Symmetry: D2
Subunit: 115 residues, 4 copies
């Protein structure tokens, strides 16, 4: 898997578990084509979204349903979702780990791109 | 103003100047309609995007063109843009300051919401 | 002022009001000497800590009492405090804005350094 | 190991490798007693700092030498170091992962506390 997403909860100090997200690829008509989704594990991770053959160069969006997470906890959130939009593989296939750290009125997202 | 955006550069320790952004509002047919746009000033701030009367309840998206900012400084960053999507004014008018803190492979965004 | 600190609350989307902090300056004998202190205002800002003449070159530490802030809101946070340690004015006088963004198990801190 | 530290580099999109840090425990005279140190691995992690028996309740500081890291990269940094100060184990032994995300003029630190 060349794409993994990890989500953490800055209020509880924990992995953010059962967070849903969808991954889209930008089509030629500039619309977002869904192609993968899942929800984070007990470790806050979502693995197995795609394969090296399928994950070709292009622009991808990860839309993380943070609002449902905060709703489940009874805490009023600001954002509808956290969106991470990036071009992949522009220099060849890489492993991408996208990390998101969530608070009700703020989030951070980082990419760690390795070999 | 009821909506202000501030952008900071975490590599240089400075305001992020001349950063373009576009704001959109979700229409009744679920499409993103253009709402306003502008570029940050020398203080990293963009003021005057809207007015209290125009900024009605709805779902708004701010798309901040962080990629062009980094490319002009010679850096090829990870993100295409930083997007902030939120419901505004659901419990009456509020003032929103969106802050974005930028690095080449990371950004943070925060909102400070005040009751006018 | 040459040194300003701004503190924001990422749980409530608000300035972090009445947050205490102490500033220290490293002495010639390598101990931390008291330099200034104060609490944030209703805007989450603490101004007036020092002056251009007093704020000489050196290593400064700002210790922000984030634990008391969260405890007064009913939260038992992870950190005892947020500490910001930095060399100031090494290439002549600068203006420093330190920003801290607080959550119960996380904080971020940023500096914006401007040449007066 | 009840204490692990992970450091990431927000400029390069990578683990922050060979970052030195020291862990201190606050003594009865309010001074900081060193007790563990190390440098991060190729994955940006530092494991094996302490043991469950030794890591008793108390106030601990992790001082991460971020300034040497940025110096090694030729990039002017703001902070002398990143300090993480916390009380441990106040409700019994936990596993603590301290994460730090570094930029030249900013850092973030988070704690994930699990079982
Ligand atoms: C593939 C590799 C060497 C690291 C990818 C990776 C990871 O495997 C675990 C991680 O745990 C983390 C746990 C945290 O509490 C945390 O704050 C981060 C940094 C995420 C931010 C502040 C956007 C990370 C983080 O970036 C991170 C992370 O980037
Ligand atoms: C003097 C100047 C051009 C900017 C200094 C400055 C400021 O005057 C106000 C600010 O408000 C902020 C409000 C926020 O919600 C916010 O998230 C930031 C970013 C700083 C973090 C994530 C620690 C800042 C921020 O860094 C900031 C900031 O750096
Ligand atoms: Cl932010
Ligand atoms: Cl603000
Ligand atoms: Cl962090
Ligand atoms: Cl983790």
């Amino acid at each position: 898997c060349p794409l993994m997403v990890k989500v953490l909860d800055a209020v509880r100090g924990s992995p953010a578990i059962n967070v849903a997200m969808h991954v889209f690829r930008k089509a030629a008509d500039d619309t977002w084509e869904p192609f993968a989704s899942g929800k984070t594990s007990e470790s806050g991770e979502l693995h197995g979204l795609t394969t090296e053959e399928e994950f070709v160069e292009g622009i991808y969006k990860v839309e993380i349903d943070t609002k449902s997470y905060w709703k489940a906890l009874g805490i009023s959130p600001f954002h509808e979702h956290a969106e991470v939009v990036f071009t992949a593989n522009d220099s060849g296939p890489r492993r991408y780990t996208i990390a998101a750290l969530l608070s009700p009125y703020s989030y951070s997202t980082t990419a760690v791109v390795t070999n």
